[PDB]
Amino acid sequence: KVLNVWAMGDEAKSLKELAQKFTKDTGIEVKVQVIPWANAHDKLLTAVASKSGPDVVQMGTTWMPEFVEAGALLDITKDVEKSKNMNSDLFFPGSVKTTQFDGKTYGVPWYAETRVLFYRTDLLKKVGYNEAPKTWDELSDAALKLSKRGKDMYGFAIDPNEQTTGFIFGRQNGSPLFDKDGTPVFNKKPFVDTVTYLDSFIKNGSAPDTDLGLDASQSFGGDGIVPMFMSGPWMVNTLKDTAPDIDGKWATAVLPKKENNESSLGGANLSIFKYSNKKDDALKFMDYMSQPDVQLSWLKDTNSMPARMDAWEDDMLKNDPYYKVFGEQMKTAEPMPLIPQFEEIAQLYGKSWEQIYRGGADVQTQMDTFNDQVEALLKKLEHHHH
Ligand SMILES: [Zn+2]
Ligand SMILES: [Zn+2]
Ligand SMILES: [Zn+2]
Ligand SMILES: [Zn+2]
Ligand SMILES: [Zn+2]
Ligand SMILES: [Zn+2]
Ligand SMILES: [Zn+2]
Ligand SMILES: [Zn+2]
Ligand SMILES: [Zn+2]
Ligand SMILES: [Zn+2]
Ligand SMILES: [Zn+2]
Ligand SMILES: [Zn+2]
Ligand SMILES: [Zn+2]
Ligand SMILES: [Zn+2]
Ligand SMILES: [Zn+2]
């Protein structure tokens, strides 16, 4: 009788609260189970293997490729086209891409995350920039200048464990990452030149090449040791809460442009488990969560940005100087390639990046080795294919 909803994390307090309001509204009873992130993969596969699980599941966008192939997620194409609040035109195009496979829809975008430039407005002004850097040459130039402030002063952070960063810059320089035949092209000139460009901030001392052990407040606040970096919407909240000393001294901006300035697109979708016996009630719970005002309540309780475009007509987003920039970036942002072993490929990239920035490898030779590893990884599907 009760609609089982799987949410991911340590806590699902805010969703329980919206689920209790949904129940008061619809007479639909909802039980939210909290699945720790390090158990969700195997928990969901177990549900598939046992043809028994929740009715609605929170799906990280990068997990969609594997759970669609695994048969975990119901084809809801027909149901969402005739819905009020779940139609694909109502969501950011990149969020929509994460739901669509062989022309079919396996979920509804719920909340979206994209990566923007965080910068110290006073520090950029100091080195001659009235606005955020707008191009790769400016990001390079502004960062080298900021690094000459002092001994352990920097200009820009390249996070060596951030999976998106390499590929976001690659696409900006016109790498498609995989060609039309699915062949990896990490060793071709648009991607190789991108990695040379990222490597230049390390070699020139404008990006840290070790773990400085600074939290965001410590690195970005104060004198602004690392005065520019890239992050998601969660960092707005963190800076306001942990670095009040820099109030009115920082902003977000859209990423600097090369051929384009497009960012990554991630977050979560709501999907129906394939063997749900309550599809009707699942679709009703999902359509409530797709309503603009619920997306805005969710944003207030958890700072997750709406995937529903109409929510962005609210003043708390439209006219917020931090979040409006995430809204603009969202418009053209592109999910990381939606294949089941992307996270492995991100990881191989991480290692190659390390061999360059730390071990001084040649960029072209190292990208040749990386491209060969991706090819090998793709041939034998050791993980995540079904
Ligand atoms: Zn919470
Ligand atoms: Zn080109
Ligand atoms: Zn060093
Ligand atoms: Zn807060
Ligand atoms: Zn609430
Ligand atoms: Zn408007
Ligand atoms: Zn585009
Ligand atoms: Zn290492
Ligand atoms: Zn060379
Ligand atoms: Zn192996
Ligand atoms: Zn894995
Ligand atoms: Zn394994
Ligand atoms: Zn897997
Ligand atoms: Zn496959
Ligand atoms: Zn399987």
mmCIF file with all atom_site columns, all heavy atoms in Angstrom, residues 348-363:
data_model
loop_
_atom_site.group_PDB
_atom_site.id
_atom_site.type_symbol
_atom_site.label_atom_id
_atom_site.label_alt_id
_atom_site.label_comp_id
_atom_site.label_asym_id
_atom_site.label_entity_id
_atom_site.label_seq_id
_atom_site.pdbx_PDB_ins_code
_atom_site.Cartn_x
_atom_site.Cartn_y
_atom_site.Cartn_z
_atom_site.occupancy
_atom_site.B_iso_or_equiv
_atom_site.pdbx_formal_charge
_atom_site.auth_seq_id
_atom_site.auth_comp_id
_atom_site.auth_asym_id
_atom_site.auth_atom_id
_atom_site.pdbx_PDB_model_num
ATOM 1   N N   . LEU A 1 348 ? 41.190 7.244  -14.578 1.00 0.00 ? 348 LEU A N   1
ATOM 2   C CA  . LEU A 1 348 ? 42.369 7.081  -15.376 1.00 0.00 ? 348 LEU A CA  1
ATOM 3   C C   . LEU A 1 348 ? 42.898 8.470  -15.734 1.00 0.00 ? 348 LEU A C   1
ATOM 4   O O   . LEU A 1 348 ? 44.102 8.680  -15.690 1.00 0.00 ? 348 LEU A O   1
ATOM 5   C CB  . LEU A 1 348 ? 42.048 6.277  -16.629 1.00 0.00 ? 348 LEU A CB  1
ATOM 6   C CG  . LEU A 1 348 ? 41.869 4.771  -16.456 1.00 0.00 ? 348 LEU A CG  1
ATOM 7   C CD1 . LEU A 1 348 ? 41.188 4.157  -17.661 1.00 0.00 ? 348 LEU A CD1 1
ATOM 8   C CD2 . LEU A 1 348 ? 43.181 4.054  -16.197 1.00 0.00 ? 348 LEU A CD2 1
ATOM 9   N N   . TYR A 1 349 ? 41.969 9.422  -16.059 1.00 0.00 ? 349 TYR A N   1
ATOM 10  C CA  . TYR A 1 349 ? 42.381 10.757 -16.391 1.00 0.00 ? 349 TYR A CA  1
ATOM 11  C C   . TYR A 1 349 ? 43.150 11.366 -15.209 1.00 0.00 ? 349 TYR A C   1
ATOM 12  O O   . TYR A 1 349 ? 44.262 11.934 -15.372 1.00 0.00 ? 349 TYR A O   1
ATOM 13  C CB  . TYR A 1 349 ? 41.233 11.665 -16.848 1.00 0.00 ? 349 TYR A CB  1
ATOM 14  C CG  . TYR A 1 349 ? 41.665 13.103 -16.893 1.00 0.00 ? 349 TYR A CG  1
ATOM 15  C CD1 . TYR A 1 349 ? 42.327 13.593 -17.996 1.00 0.00 ? 349 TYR A CD1 1
ATOM 16  C CD2 . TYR A 1 349 ? 41.548 13.918 -15.783 1.00 0.00 ? 349 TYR A CD2 1
ATOM 17  C CE1 . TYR A 1 349 ? 42.799 14.904 -18.058 1.00 0.00 ? 349 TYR A CE1 1
ATOM 18  C CE2 . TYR A 1 349 ? 42.034 15.217 -15.807 1.00 0.00 ? 349 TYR A CE2 1
ATOM 19  C CZ  . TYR A 1 349 ? 42.646 15.728 -16.956 1.00 0.00 ? 349 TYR A CZ  1
ATOM 20  O OH  . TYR A 1 349 ? 43.123 17.003 -16.972 1.00 0.00 ? 349 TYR A OH  1
ATOM 21  N N   . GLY A 1 350 ? 42.585 11.200 -14.015 1.00 0.00 ? 350 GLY A N   1
ATOM 22  C CA  . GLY A 1 350 ? 43.218 11.701 -12.789 1.00 0.00 ? 350 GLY A CA  1
ATOM 23  C C   . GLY A 1 350 ? 44.650 11.267 -12.667 1.00 0.00 ? 350 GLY A C   1
ATOM 24  O O   . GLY A 1 350 ? 45.522 12.068 -12.210 1.00 0.00 ? 350 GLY A O   1
ATOM 25  N N   . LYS A 1 351 ? 44.897 9.977  -12.936 1.00 0.00 ? 351 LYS A N   1
ATOM 26  C CA  . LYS A 1 351 ? 46.284 9.406  -12.819 1.00 0.00 ? 351 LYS A CA  1
ATOM 27  C C   . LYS A 1 351 ? 47.213 10.038 -13.860 1.00 0.00 ? 351 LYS A C   1
ATOM 28  O O   . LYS A 1 351 ? 48.295 10.413 -13.582 1.00 0.00 ? 351 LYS A O   1
ATOM 29  C CB  . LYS A 1 351 ? 46.286 7.911  -13.100 1.00 0.00 ? 351 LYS A CB  1
ATOM 30  C CG  . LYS A 1 351 ? 47.641 7.248  -13.009 1.00 0.00 ? 351 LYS A CG  1
ATOM 31  C CD  . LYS A 1 351 ? 48.245 7.268  -11.624 1.00 0.00 ? 351 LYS A CD  1
ATOM 32  C CE  . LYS A 1 351 ? 49.665 6.746  -11.617 1.00 0.00 ? 351 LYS A CE  1
ATOM 33  N NZ  . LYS A 1 351 ? 50.377 7.215  -10.410 1.00 0.00 ? 351 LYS A NZ  1
ATOM 34  N N   . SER A 1 352 ? 46.763 10.086 -15.102 1.00 0.00 ? 352 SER A N   1
ATOM 35  C CA  . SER A 1 352 ? 47.551 10.765 -16.186 1.00 0.00 ? 352 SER A CA  1
ATOM 36  C C   . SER A 1 352 ? 47.843 12.220 -15.813 1.00 0.00 ? 352 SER A C   1
ATOM 37  O O   . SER A 1 352 ? 48.988 12.689 -15.969 1.00 0.00 ? 352 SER A O   1
ATOM 38  C CB  . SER A 1 352 ? 46.884 10.648 -17.492 1.00 0.00 ? 352 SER A CB  1
ATOM 39  O OG  . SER A 1 352 ? 47.203 9.434  -18.113 1.00 0.00 ? 352 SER A OG  1
ATOM 40  N N   . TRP A 1 353 ? 46.856 12.899 -15.246 1.00 0.00 ? 353 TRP A N   1
ATOM 41  C CA  . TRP A 1 353 ? 47.034 14.282 -14.860 1.00 0.00 ? 353 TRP A CA  1
ATOM 42  C C   . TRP A 1 353 ? 48.133 14.422 -13.810 1.00 0.00 ? 353 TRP A C   1
ATOM 43  O O   . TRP A 1 353 ? 48.987 15.305 -13.884 1.00 0.00 ? 353 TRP A O   1
ATOM 44  C CB  . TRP A 1 353 ? 45.715 14.889 -14.393 1.00 0.00 ? 353 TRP A CB  1
ATOM 45  C CG  . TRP A 1 353 ? 45.826 16.234 -13.762 1.00 0.00 ? 353 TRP A CG  1
ATOM 46  C CD1 . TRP A 1 353 ? 45.464 16.543 -12.494 1.00 0.00 ? 353 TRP A CD1 1
ATOM 47  C CD2 . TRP A 1 353 ? 46.310 17.456 -14.358 1.00 0.00 ? 353 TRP A CD2 1
ATOM 48  N NE1 . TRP A 1 353 ? 45.658 17.870 -12.248 1.00 0.00 ? 353 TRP A NE1 1
ATOM 49  C CE2 . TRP A 1 353 ? 46.207 18.456 -13.361 1.00 0.00 ? 353 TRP A CE2 1
ATOM 50  C CE3 . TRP A 1 353 ? 46.871 17.785 -15.610 1.00 0.00 ? 353 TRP A CE3 1
ATOM 51  C CZ2 . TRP A 1 353 ? 46.594 19.772 -13.571 1.00 0.00 ? 353 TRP A CZ2 1
ATOM 52  C CZ3 . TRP A 1 353 ? 47.244 19.095 -15.827 1.00 0.00 ? 353 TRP A CZ3 1
ATOM 53  C CH2 . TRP A 1 353 ? 47.096 20.073 -14.831 1.00 0.00 ? 353 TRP A CH2 1
ATOM 54  N N   . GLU A 1 354 ? 48.098 13.530 -12.863 1.00 0.00 ? 354 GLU A N   1
ATOM 55  C CA  . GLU A 1 354 ? 49.110 13.475 -11.838 1.00 0.00 ? 354 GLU A CA  1
ATOM 56  C C   . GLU A 1 354 ? 50.524 13.255 -12.415 1.00 0.00 ? 354 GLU A C   1
ATOM 57  O O   . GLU A 1 354 ? 51.444 13.862 -11.953 1.00 0.00 ? 354 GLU A O   1
ATOM 58  C CB  . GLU A 1 354 ? 48.792 12.381 -10.847 1.00 0.00 ? 354 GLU A CB  1
ATOM 59  C CG  . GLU A 1 354 ? 49.722 12.384 -9.680  1.00 0.00 ? 354 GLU A CG  1
ATOM 60  C CD  . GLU A 1 354 ? 49.272 11.425 -8.642  1.00 0.00 ? 354 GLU A CD  1
ATOM 61  O OE1 . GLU A 1 354 ? 49.641 10.220 -8.757  1.00 0.00 ? 354 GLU A OE1 1
ATOM 62  O OE2 . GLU A 1 354 ? 48.548 11.914 -7.771  1.00 0.00 ? 354 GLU A OE2 1
ATOM 63  N N   . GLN A 1 355 ? 50.661 12.353 -13.377 1.00 0.00 ? 355 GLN A N   1
ATOM 64  C CA  . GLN A 1 355 ? 51.939 12.015 -13.943 1.00 0.00 ? 355 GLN A CA  1
ATOM 65  C C   . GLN A 1 355 ? 52.520 13.239 -14.666 1.00 0.00 ? 355 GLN A C   1
ATOM 66  O O   . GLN A 1 355 ? 53.721 13.335 -14.753 1.00 0.00 ? 355 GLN A O   1
ATOM 67  C CB  . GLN A 1 355 ? 51.838 10.898 -14.970 1.00 0.00 ? 355 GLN A CB  1
ATOM 68  C CG  . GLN A 1 355 ? 51.144 9.641  -14.458 1.00 0.00 ? 355 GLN A CG  1
ATOM 69  C CD  . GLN A 1 355 ? 52.099 8.680  -13.836 1.00 0.00 ? 355 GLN A CD  1
ATOM 70  O OE1 . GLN A 1 355 ? 52.850 9.040  -12.935 1.00 0.00 ? 355 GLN A OE1 1
ATOM 71  N NE2 . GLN A 1 355 ? 52.035 7.451  -14.324 1.00 0.00 ? 355 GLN A NE2 1
ATOM 72  N N   . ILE A 1 356 ? 51.644 14.094 -15.216 1.00 0.00 ? 356 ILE A N   1
ATOM 73  C CA  . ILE A 1 356 ? 51.995 15.376 -15.811 1.00 0.00 ? 356 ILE A CA  1
ATOM 74  C C   . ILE A 1 356 ? 52.320 16.387 -14.701 1.00 0.00 ? 356 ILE A C   1
ATOM 75  O O   . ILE A 1 356 ? 53.493 16.852 -14.609 1.00 0.00 ? 356 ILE A O   1
ATOM 76  C CB  . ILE A 1 356 ? 50.878 15.839 -16.764 1.00 0.00 ? 356 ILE A CB  1
ATOM 77  C CG1 . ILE A 1 356 ? 50.853 14.987 -18.038 1.00 0.00 ? 356 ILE A CG1 1
ATOM 78  C CG2 . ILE A 1 356 ? 50.985 17.308 -17.112 1.00 0.00 ? 356 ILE A CG2 1
ATOM 79  C CD1 . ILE A 1 356 ? 49.533 14.953 -18.743 1.00 0.00 ? 356 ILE A CD1 1
ATOM 80  N N   . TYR A 1 357 ? 51.352 16.766 -13.891 1.00 0.00 ? 357 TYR A N   1
ATOM 81  C CA  . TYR A 1 357 ? 51.537 17.937 -12.996 1.00 0.00 ? 357 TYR A CA  1
ATOM 82  C C   . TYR A 1 357 ? 52.583 17.648 -11.904 1.00 0.00 ? 357 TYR A C   1
ATOM 83  O O   . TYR A 1 357 ? 53.276 18.585 -11.484 1.00 0.00 ? 357 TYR A O   1
ATOM 84  C CB  . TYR A 1 357 ? 50.228 18.465 -12.381 1.00 0.00 ? 357 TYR A CB  1
ATOM 85  C CG  . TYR A 1 357 ? 49.735 17.812 -11.105 1.00 0.00 ? 357 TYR A CG  1
ATOM 86  C CD1 . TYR A 1 357 ? 50.236 18.192 -9.864  1.00 0.00 ? 357 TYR A CD1 1
ATOM 87  C CD2 . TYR A 1 357 ? 48.672 16.923 -11.133 1.00 0.00 ? 357 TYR A CD2 1
ATOM 88  C CE1 . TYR A 1 357 ? 49.778 17.620 -8.700  1.00 0.00 ? 357 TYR A CE1 1
ATOM 89  C CE2 . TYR A 1 357 ? 48.182 16.357 -9.976  1.00 0.00 ? 357 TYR A CE2 1
ATOM 90  C CZ  . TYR A 1 357 ? 48.735 16.704 -8.757  1.00 0.00 ? 357 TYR A CZ  1
ATOM 91  O OH  . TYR A 1 357 ? 48.256 16.091 -7.626  1.00 0.00 ? 357 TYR A OH  1
ATOM 92  N N   . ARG A 1 358 ? 52.711 16.395 -11.470 1.00 0.00 ? 358 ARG A N   1
ATOM 93  C CA  . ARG A 1 358 ? 53.593 16.055 -10.352 1.00 0.00 ? 358 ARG A CA  1
ATOM 94  C C   . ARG A 1 358 ? 54.867 15.385 -10.891 1.00 0.00 ? 358 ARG A C   1
ATOM 95  O O   . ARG A 1 358 ? 55.913 15.674 -10.384 1.00 0.00 ? 358 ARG A O   1
ATOM 96  C CB  . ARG A 1 358 ? 52.888 15.141 -9.329  1.00 0.00 ? 358 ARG A CB  1
ATOM 97  C CG  . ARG A 1 358 ? 53.676 14.894 -8.046  1.00 0.00 ? 358 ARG A CG  1
ATOM 98  C CD  . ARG A 1 358 ? 52.810 14.561 -6.851  1.00 0.00 ? 358 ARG A CD  1
ATOM 99  N NE  . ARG A 1 358 ? 52.318 13.192 -6.845  1.00 0.00 ? 358 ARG A NE  1
ATOM 100 C CZ  . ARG A 1 358 ? 51.339 12.740 -6.045  1.00 0.00 ? 358 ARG A CZ  1
ATOM 101 N NH1 . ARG A 1 358 ? 50.767 13.550 -5.166  1.00 0.00 ? 358 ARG A NH1 1
ATOM 102 N NH2 . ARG A 1 358 ? 50.926 11.485 -6.131  1.00 0.00 ? 358 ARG A NH2 1
ATOM 103 N N   . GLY A 1 359 ? 54.743 14.448 -11.845 1.00 0.00 ? 359 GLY A N   1
ATOM 104 C CA  . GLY A 1 359 ? 55.859 13.606 -12.301 1.00 0.00 ? 359 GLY A CA  1
ATOM 105 C C   . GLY A 1 359 ? 56.582 14.162 -13.523 1.00 0.00 ? 359 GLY A C   1
ATOM 106 O O   . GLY A 1 359 ? 57.449 13.504 -14.048 1.00 0.00 ? 359 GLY A O   1
ATOM 107 N N   . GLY A 1 360 ? 56.134 15.317 -14.026 1.00 0.00 ? 360 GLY A N   1
ATOM 108 C CA  . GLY A 1 360 ? 56.714 15.992 -15.172 1.00 0.00 ? 360 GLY A CA  1
ATOM 109 C C   . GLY A 1 360 ? 56.654 15.207 -16.483 1.00 0.00 ? 360 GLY A C   1
ATOM 110 O O   . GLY A 1 360 ? 57.459 15.489 -17.361 1.00 0.00 ? 360 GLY A O   1
ATOM 111 N N   . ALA A 1 361 ? 55.683 14.301 -16.677 1.00 0.00 ? 361 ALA A N   1
ATOM 112 C CA  . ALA A 1 361 ? 55.585 13.595 -17.971 1.00 0.00 ? 361 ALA A CA  1
ATOM 113 C C   . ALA A 1 361 ? 55.263 14.576 -19.111 1.00 0.00 ? 361 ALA A C   1
ATOM 114 O O   . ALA A 1 361 ? 54.635 15.630 -18.908 1.00 0.00 ? 361 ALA A O   1
ATOM 115 C CB  . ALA A 1 361 ? 54.537 12.529 -17.925 1.00 0.00 ? 361 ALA A CB  1
ATOM 116 N N   . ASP A 1 362 ? 55.651 14.171 -20.314 1.00 0.00 ? 362 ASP A N   1
ATOM 117 C CA  . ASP A 1 362 ? 55.268 14.884 -21.516 1.00 0.00 ? 362 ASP A CA  1
ATOM 118 C C   . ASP A 1 362 ? 53.753 14.654 -21.730 1.00 0.00 ? 362 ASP A C   1
ATOM 119 O O   . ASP A 1 362 ? 53.276 13.517 -21.599 1.00 0.00 ? 362 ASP A O   1
ATOM 120 C CB  . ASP A 1 362 ? 56.144 14.417 -22.682 1.00 0.00 ? 362 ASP A CB  1
ATOM 121 C CG  . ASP A 1 362 ? 55.682 14.888 -24.047 1.00 0.00 ? 362 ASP A CG  1
ATOM 122 O OD1 . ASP A 1 362 ? 56.050 16.020 -24.427 1.00 0.00 ? 362 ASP A OD1 1
ATOM 123 O OD2 . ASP A 1 362 ? 54.930 14.148 -24.714 1.00 0.00 ? 362 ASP A OD2 1
ATOM 124 N N   . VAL A 1 363 ? 53.020 15.732 -22.070 1.00 0.00 ? 363 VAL A N   1
ATOM 125 C CA  . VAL A 1 363 ? 51.606 15.764 -22.192 1.00 0.00 ? 363 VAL A CA  1
ATOM 126 C C   . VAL A 1 363 ? 51.165 14.793 -23.299 1.00 0.00 ? 363 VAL A C   1
ATOM 127 O O   . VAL A 1 363 ? 50.279 13.968 -23.034 1.00 0.00 ? 363 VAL A O   1
ATOM 128 C CB  . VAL A 1 363 ? 51.024 17.196 -22.375 1.00 0.00 ? 363 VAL A CB  1
ATOM 129 C CG1 . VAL A 1 363 ? 49.479 17.178 -22.538 1.00 0.00 ? 363 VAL A CG1 1
ATOM 130 C CG2 . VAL A 1 363 ? 51.335 18.039 -21.155 1.00 0.00 ? 363 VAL A CG2 1
#
